[PDB]
């Protein structure tokens, strides 16, 4: 988020590439998500990469 | 209650179906809570204890 207060830290800005109305075209979009649904990507090393 | 004003956005994924998610919590971020009167709760725990 900002980090700081634990109640704010949790608001993870989460950017990703999603399929557009045309299947060939792809758009980079972000969705605000918080805590548990966002899981550190398996086999990464404390990186910015996460999984659902 | 949940105090923070939260905006909403949607994303079209492929044809038809849209996906919904929070755009950004638009206010300040305060805690989420449940108020309960103490009086009535301490009256309850003892009344249950009696029975």
């Amino acid at each position, epitope marked *: 988020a900002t980090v700081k207060t634990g109640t704010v830290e949790e608001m993870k800005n989460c950017s990703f590439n999603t399929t557009t109305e045309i299947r060939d075209k792809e758009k980079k979009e972000y969705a605000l998500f918080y805590k548990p649904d966002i899981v550190p990507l398996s086999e990464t090393n404390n990186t910015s990469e996460y999984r659902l | 209650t949940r*105090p923070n004003n939260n905006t909403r956005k949607s994303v079209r994924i492929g044809p038809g179906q849209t996906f919904y998610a929070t755009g950004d919590i638009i*206010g300040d971020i*305060k*805690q989420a809570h449940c108020n309960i009167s103490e009086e009535k709760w301490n009256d309850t725990l003892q009344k249950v204890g009696i029975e």
Partner: antibody, heavy 126, light 110 residues
Framework: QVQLVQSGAEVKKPGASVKVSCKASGYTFTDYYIHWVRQAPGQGLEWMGWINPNSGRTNSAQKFQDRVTMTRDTSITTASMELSRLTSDDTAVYYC????????????????????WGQGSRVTVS | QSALTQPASVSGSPGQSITISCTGTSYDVGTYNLVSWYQQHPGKAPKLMIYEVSKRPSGVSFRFSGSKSGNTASLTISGLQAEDAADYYCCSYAGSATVIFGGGSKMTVL
């Protein structure tokens, strides 16, 4: 009693930036929001938003849109504004003022309750 | 999204009750009781005169009152004094964690 102490006067060239700041004293600043206003010498006041001293989070007023950014340093009870690309239109007295109480469970950032004000500071753009 | 509209100036006799009005929109007020009033002697930072539409702050005497109605609100000053020659301003919650500052009105005295 509650003090809000500002810097002295300053003058800048167009396109320049200025830091405007204030020190809180006589109470604990961590418990309140700090808001900022401007008053041009012939006008009413313009409002700039609140900085939560603890979080360092803020909301910017309409017609600024990051033209001005705000920061804080809790170790010295000091609030600051960083005002960029100054135009002659920006000449005004800048004031530091204390807003409502802050608490973790309910939002109280919009409250127009400015009980304590600083001395004001002159910002001239020449 | 404009400033609260206020009379440029108002006036009256010593002892006279003066009411100062401020106008906005239903989004600005109907939704909120987040209304306050300030006054300032020229050359000085403003004093808060009213909290929560009509509540006197400590330090504000029982001369000052107020109310809200529809898209407007007002301050009532009983007992007009020469000393009231100060600017008066409204301000209120704009919504979306931002604050409206009013245009202001000047007190002049007779």
């Amino acid at each position: 009693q509650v003090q809000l102490v500002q810097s002295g006067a300053e003058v800048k060239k167009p396109g320049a930036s200025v830091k405007v700041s204030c020190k809180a004293s006589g109470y604990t600043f961590t418990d309140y929001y700090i808001h900022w206003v401007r008053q041009a010498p012939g006008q009413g006041l313009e409002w700039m938003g609140w900085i939560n001293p603890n979080s360092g989070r803020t909301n910017s007023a309409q017609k600024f849109q990051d033209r001005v950014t705000m920061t804080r340093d809790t170790s010295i009870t000091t609030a600051s504004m960083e005002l960029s690309r100054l135009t002659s239109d920006d000449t005004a007295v800048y004031y530091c003022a204390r807003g409502g109480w802050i608490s973790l469970y309910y939002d109280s950032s919009g409250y127009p309750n400015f009980n304590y004000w600083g001395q004001g500071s002159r910002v001239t753009v020449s | 999204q404009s400033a609260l509209t206020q009379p440029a100036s108002v006036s009256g006799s010593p002892g006279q009750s003066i009411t100062i009005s401020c106008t906005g929109t239903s989004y600005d007020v109907g939704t909120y009781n987040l209304v306050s009033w300030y006054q300032q002697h020229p050359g000085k930072a403003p004093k808060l005169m009213i909290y929560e539409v009509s509540k006197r702050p400590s330090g504000v005497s029982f001369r000052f009152s107020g109310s809200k109605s529809g898209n407007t609100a007002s301050l009532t000053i009983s007992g007009l004094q020469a000393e009231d020659a100060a600017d008066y301003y409204c301000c209120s919650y704009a919504g979306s964690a931002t604050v409206i500052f009013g245009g202001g009105s000047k007190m002049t005295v007779l």
